[PDB]
Amino acid sequence: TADLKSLAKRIYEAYLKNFNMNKVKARVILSGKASNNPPFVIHDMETLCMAEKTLVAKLVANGIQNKEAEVRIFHCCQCTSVETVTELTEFAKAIPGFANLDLNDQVTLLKYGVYEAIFAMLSSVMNKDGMLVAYGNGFITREFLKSLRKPFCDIMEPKFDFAMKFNALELDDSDISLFVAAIICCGDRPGLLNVGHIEKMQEGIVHVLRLHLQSNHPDDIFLFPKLLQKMADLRQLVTEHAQLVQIIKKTESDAALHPLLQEIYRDMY
Ligand SMILES: CC(C)(Oc1ccc(C(=O)c2ccc(Cl)cc2)cc1)C(=O)O
Ligand SMILES: *c1ccc([N+](=O)[O-])cc1C(=O)Nc1ccccc1
Ligand SMILES: *c1ccc([N+](=O)[O-])cc1C(=O)Nc1ccccc1
Ligand SMILES: *c1ccc([N+](=O)[O-])cc1C(=O)Nc1ccccc1
């Protein structure tokens, strides 16, 4: 079309603008074809404490430091998502009609959707062996994550499984931008007031996405349906994650939950 392609572009531009780590900037680091200075590999406890030597500032004033090895990892890992939530909250502005929604419906969308988008985008920085960290400056291996003591070794491995099959779709930021937009405009979230209004808004994004996918990836005929399954998959992935988070709350007495994330997880699933 033309007006649609403008909207699809308006979304993409908001994607690159807000999220500092896109799939292009990431796949080039993992390829190592643009530089000979690879990110610092974190594969065991020694390499971890080395890299942590860089953040000794944020670690001392936060009281972690002497905390357990796993707690330290996923303590800063929370600060990441808190940032991605903010970037996502701003990315939602560009969505046509979103800013107009009732302030309650806006928060509800961003409540049940953020983590579904975080894990989706989180695939862009993963591979079969690990993921990028610190805006591409670090690469934490996948086996080291599976080596932590339970239940921390069950946190990231599920996401790696999704990112491997999801990456297999060969998507570019051009598409993910729209894909993440549709995730936020899901009219299925509990507590939505104007269900009719939101569904109209989502159908616009999905319609744009369905044509964009057929245009940018014409050979993968059922690519659009596959992604719909992925949305369903992510919805399930975030649910299990929420259960595993609350499981860490009812047992681990030395792992505190970030204030912002508390409100998100509160009575989520
Ligand atoms: C992906 C990530 C960081 O996943 C978590 C993994 C571990 C924790 C915790 O260590 C923790 C701390 C306090 C409580 Cl009450 C429960 C769990 C939190 C989130 C997220 O969700 O952004
Ligand atoms: C998260 C957990 C642990 C560390 N660390 O001790 O090396 C770092 C991070 C992290 O995400 N650091 C970061 C984020 C963004 C930009 C630069 C560095
Ligand atoms: C945790 C959640 C999300 C990201 N991310 O996609 O930027 C990274 C991490 C993480 O584990 N960061 C990290 C960096 C350095 C040392 C430990 C942990
Ligand atoms: C955010 C970024 C980096 C670190 N760190 O490596 O010390 C910590 C945090 C952070 O906000 N931790 C936290 C968890 C729970 C409640 C408040 C703060």
Contact 132, 29 (CB under 8 A): yes
First to last CA, the chain: 39
Tell me, in angstroms, the distance from the centre of ligand 2 to residue 104's CA.
Answer: 32
Q: Which residues contact 147 (CB under 8 A, 6 or more apart)?
A: 44, 153
Tell me, in angstroms, the distance from the centre of ligand 1 to residue 8's CA.
Answer: 33
**Smallest CA separation from ligand 4 atom 6, residue:** 76
Tell me, in angstroms, the distance from the centre of ligand 2 to residue 245's CA.
Answer: 20
Q: Which atom belonging to ligand 1 lies closest to the Cα atom of 262? A: 15
249 lines ligand 4 (CB under 6 A): no
Other C-beta atoms within 10 Å of 5: how many? 13
- Solved using: X-ray
Per-residue burial over 165-182, b if 16 or more Cβ lie within 10 Å, else e, is: ebbebebebbbbbbbbbb
The residue type found at 209 is L
Angle at 240 between CA 236 and CA 242, to 5 degrees: 115
d(CA 36, CA 255): 38
Three-state DSSP state, 242: helix
Out of 56, 74, 79, mutate this one to test ligand 4's pocket (max ligand atoms within 8 Å of CB): namely 79
Q: Report the candidate in 182, 174, 192, 175 with the shortest Cα–Cα distance to residue 235.
A: 182
Alpha helix (H) residue ranges in the chain: 3-18, 23-31, 45-52, 56-60, 69-91, 103-122, 142-147, 157-167, 173-184, 195-216, 223-249, 259-265
Q: Is residue 115 marked as binding?
A: yes
d(CA 235, CA 155): 16
Contact 28, 125 (CB under 8 A): no
Q: Which residue is listed with tokens 């998507």? A: 171
The residue type found at 210 is R
